[PDB]
A paper describes a structure:
SLC26A2 is a vital solute carrier responsible for transporting essential nutritional ions, including sulfate, within the human body. SLC26A2 is known to function as an electroneutral anion exchanger, facilitating the exchange of various substrates such as SO42− and C2O42− for Cl−, hydroxide (OH−), or even with each other.
We purified the overexpressed SLC26A2 in Lauryl Maltose Neopentyl Glycol (LMNG) detergent with 150 mM NaCl at pH 7.5 and then determined the structure, termed SLC26A2-Cl-, by cryo-EM. The final reconstruction achieved a resolution of ~3.2 Å, with sufficient quality for model building. The resulting model covers residues 52–724 without several flexible loops containing residues 186–210, 319–333, and 617–644. The result shows that our SLC26A2 structure is open to the cytosolic side and closed to the extracellular side. Interestingly, this Cl- does not interact strongly with any surrounding residues. Combining data from three individual runs, we estimated that the substrate-binding pocket is occupied by Cl- ~82 ± 4% of the time.
Residue numbers in the entry:
A (entry chain B), B (entry chain A): 52 to 185, 211 to 318, 334 to 616, 645 to 724
Write the structure that this text describes.
């Protein structure tokens, strides 16, 4: 008794008429739903009118001043890492917070300056500064280039949000992103070492910069101020055990101002800007083609990190974050502020962690931080003068510590997925050495190739029956399975295609007869059926269809029957389209391994 | 009653000691087997002493003169396409045949000049000629560059043979190679159009050359000789229906010599060389770094095509061709002749087809061709003077026709594998336009990405039981399957990893409850078990382990049980290593979908 399943009728509707009908059903021209899109595009007018202030005002207000003071050195630093004046980091943070409060659904994430992104902006800035030469007084050209790159990144992000092409985010694996952030953290530490030691080594760019910078540091170690070094050592000793950062920076600034440490030729930040808020300057609009390629990566890593963090903190509690709206928000946190003097913004884990430790479920707290920043941007900025600039490096290293600790999870990573660990290590090496962008590209492709390698050398085994059941499983992995003689079931856990067709043939020949050599031996001068378990064969390429046909023909030439079992509907469709089973030949494809085994047993009898 | 299969004990031998022991068992220092390696490396002293001359001498001798005369215009042409003097093509063909008779196992293949490879050599030659400027009198530098590239390609091929790294050949799919050869044939036709029309348009190189050459042809169409055009039209008319080529070239040469067609400013080949065989010149040995990258592709496409053709013609009858020995042979068909004045060699289908039509199973015929070439290289070369050079273009186009006919198989290709057809079309476009090398790289990566896309959007469905059996199959593909209520089996035919984890979650939520929205609705204010068929899940990434854990946790939060069935041994190992089933929790993983369904039915009762 053979199975006689009947296939369902395929849908005849495949033209664009049905697509147009379903697009109209989607109501592109939506009456009375334009308010919904306005509310969807402006989440701010959805929870502020329904704000439970009596239960969250204290939480939002609390630690907002601490976070704002805590966002203060981060800006004066990463701006320096980005090749920008310190006031530009403050502008970036304030504008990012204010705009994300307008457009934002995570309600727990901390948008603003991201170290990895600032390192990448810095690379593009220095390249354009050199390609140009070093009323653009160096810093003016730097901020112009940074704002242009930010505008391009925001345009790309909003285009990906509108075109619904955000699925590219799936190509950035969590392990690959962790490796990239670790490598970028190593690069940031190497860059900040020069400020930590007080040297004046030249700008190093290109593949191997990390090594060039370290070599320069070693070469110029004798030109050590020994004052900034002492301050940095004390700050590292105090902050390594880990509000501590705010106290440290306040005490360091007070000591530097009182003792006049600059008399020892101590490098310090300058009077960057007064209350300021200078009138906005439009982007270059002519330099836009030159720095588009870098903006590609900046936009991707920016939106990938933001979406990942927002989804994580939404699924933690009250998951109501829309991916497309966060696309639009992170895009507009890089378009409107780029009209002003700001660089790219993204979610920062080290500062979101600070708000998570002390805070509540209200985005209004970010506004408070902005207000604090605004206050810092109005009258408290001169109070930040006379910073030792070694405390800045200590403050950057301490924050990176979060990403640098990932090396302690390598034994745990290995004990779960070896190839994921290898991808992580390769991405970390390619980001630390080589280039940050080149490192990301190397990581994304190596992960895709690892998926190709996993396919390339797959598992292949013989199947045995489980006693008193209709279950077949690998003999090479399980024990005490009945294997009747003259029938050998071969399971090949992989898609059969151009990459692994040779491996499939070699494994089948090694475990069963290898009919080619037998045929040549017969021409010069036990087994009767073989069942191929196609349950794990995901798809079939033209090579796979040809390989299966060749296998069947070569085995039938000797006299060994070949039966295919548990084929997918798509695999069966490919086999019928590939002209494998001829027309109504029958007894060639089976719906289960048990059915094929029973048929093979009956055929000999 | 639950299944209680016991797993086999894993092998404790994993260190390098066992590898060293098996390497010694391989007998690296082999006594009395050095003769075997000598015979293996020199196949010539394995069938010549055992040559059945009485049954194959007539076949080998027959059509050898025709093939040699037929290899004559092919050289005078493709050398011109390769930016070389015509005598260099004759040298290449003669040396390739002679050396492959020494080292060769296919015994039916025709090594020699390959059109696609000559086009690629030409590109590298013209670039180096320009990078240098245009006792190297242009042609001397061209042959020096070509010989250097050939030496590098042969070194790469022999290195791949010795290192056993020939598996790279699996990345060049048959459809991708067919597309590349079609695009390269289009490029060759475009290049030979200038000789067909008799114009003198400038050298065009870079991406889009095909378009630049065609634009130049259209611009200079008015400068048509109308004599070479008439000769080419007559030759095309005669040869298009398709020994015909030899008669055509002989008649054209005789007519040109008798009528003195060169009086009409007809471009013609010159007195390239006398009997010649000038003393060999060593490769550049200093220019070797510059043209290594091009030699990478030349070596790969050369060895891939040669191995494919040899394996095909061996498996057709008497399969005794070793892949590694053919690696060595094709490498040494590019190393020793590069010491002389020759360029790269590979199997040519159009000329192997000529020998297949008229020939026998003896490589000695190739020697005969070499002899003919040698005779042509000794005294018959001046007889080939005064060739119209339009017959050459006609002779190149006719031969390409074999690869150009592939466009007629597109409807057949679509009716078998749509993605393979798309890869073929993309590779053909990237080889015709863009660059030949860039086209190959674009094809190889797009095929790997298509394997990634096939994974990205996979099949997912609900499984129903087949009546009076223990077989579950897709409800969306088959008909009349029992689906008990409260239990829904979800089959996801793909590996679960970072790329398709979101798709897996979305499909499972769409077809079953979507527990997140249900949980938020329950907090604001039928199904009990779900069985996941992991039979088609090939592997599990760190993301896949996390996704499965998250799915189980979220479904158990609502109150819906999640059971995993038919997991691979590797998938089970990943789940245990990933801390998914805790310790001895039981009733979480099942060996069959029927077992899980029975357990789910029992649990409610
Ligand atoms: Cl950071
Ligand atoms: Cl060809």
């Amino acid at each position: 008794h053979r199975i006689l399943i009947e296939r369902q009728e395929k849908s005849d509707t495949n033209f664009k008429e049905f697509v147009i009908k379903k697009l109209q059903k989607n109501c592109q021209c939506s009456p009375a739903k334009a308010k919904n899109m306005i509310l969807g595009f402006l989440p701010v007018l959805q929870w502020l009118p329904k704000y439970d202030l009596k239960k969250n005002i204290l939480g939002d207000v609390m630690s907002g001043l601490i976070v704002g003071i805590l966002l203060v050195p981060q800006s004066i630093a990463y701006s320096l890492l980005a090749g920008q004046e310190p006031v530009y980091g403050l502008y970036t943070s304030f504008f990012a917070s204010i705009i994300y409060f307008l457009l934002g659904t995570s309600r727990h994430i901390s948008v603003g300056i991201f170290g990895v992104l600032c390192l990448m902006i810095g690379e593009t800035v220095d390249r354009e500064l050199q390609k140009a030469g070093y009323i653009c007084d160096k810093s003016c050209y730097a901020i112009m280039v940074g704002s242009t790159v930010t505008f391009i990144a925001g345009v790309y992000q909003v285009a990906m949000g509108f075109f619904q092409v955000g699925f590219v985010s799936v190509y950035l694996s969590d392990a690959l992103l962790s490796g990239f952030v670790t490598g970028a953290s190593f690069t940031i530490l190497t860059s900040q070492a020069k400020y930590l030691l007080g040297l004046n080594l030249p700008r190093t760019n290109g593949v191997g910069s990390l090594i060039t910078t370290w070599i320069h540091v070693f070469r110029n170690i004798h030109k050590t101020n020994l004052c900034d070094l002492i301050t940095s050592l004390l700050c590292l000793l105090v902050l390594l055990p880990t509000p501590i950062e705010l106290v440290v920076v306040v005490a360091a600034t007070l000591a530097s101002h009182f003792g006049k440490l600059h008399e020892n030729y101590n490098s310090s930040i300058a009077g960057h800007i007064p209350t300021g808020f200078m009138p906005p300057k439009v982007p270059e609009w002519n330099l836009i083609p030159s720095v588009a390629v870098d903006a590609i990566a900046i936009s991707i890593i920016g939106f990938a990190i933001t979406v990942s963090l927002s989804e994580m903190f939404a699924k933690k509690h009250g998951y109501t974050v829309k991916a497309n709206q966060e696309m639009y928000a992170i895009g507009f946190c890089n378009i409107i502020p780029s009209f002003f003097h700001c660089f790219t913004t993204s979610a920062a884990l080290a500062k979101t962690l600070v708000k998570e430790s002390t805070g509540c479920h209200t985005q209004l707290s970010g506004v408070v931080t902005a207000l604090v920043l605004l206050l810092v941007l109005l009258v408290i900025a001169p109070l930040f003068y006379s910073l030792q600039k070694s405390v800045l490096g200590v403050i950057t290293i301490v924050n990176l510590r979060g990403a640098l600790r990932k090396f302690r999870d390598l034994p745990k990573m290995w004990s779960i997925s070896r190839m994921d660990t290898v991808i992580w290590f390769v991405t970390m090496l390619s980001s630390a050495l080589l280039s940050t962008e080149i490192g990301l590209l190397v990581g994304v492709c190596f992960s895709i190739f690892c998926v190709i390698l996993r396919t390339q050398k797959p598992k292949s085994s013989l199947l045995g029956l489980v006693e008193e059941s209709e279950v077949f499983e690998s003999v090479s992995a399980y024990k005490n399975l009945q294997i009747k003689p003259g029938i050998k079931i071969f399971r090949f856990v992989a898609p059969l295609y151009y990459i692994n067709k040779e491996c499939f043939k070699s494994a089948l020949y090694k475990q069963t007869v290898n009919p080619i050599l037998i045929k040549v031996a017969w021409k010069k001068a036990e087994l009767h059926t073989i069942v191929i378990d196609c349950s794990a064969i995901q798809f079939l390429d033209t090579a796979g269809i040809h390989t299966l046909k060749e296998v069947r023909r070569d085995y039938e030439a000797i006299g060994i029957q070949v039966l295919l079992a548990q084929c997918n509907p798509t695999v069966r469709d490919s086999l019928t389209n590939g002209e494998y089973c001829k027309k109504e030949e029958e007894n060639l494809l089976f719906y289960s391994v048990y059915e094929a085994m029973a048929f093979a047993e009956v055929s000999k009898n």
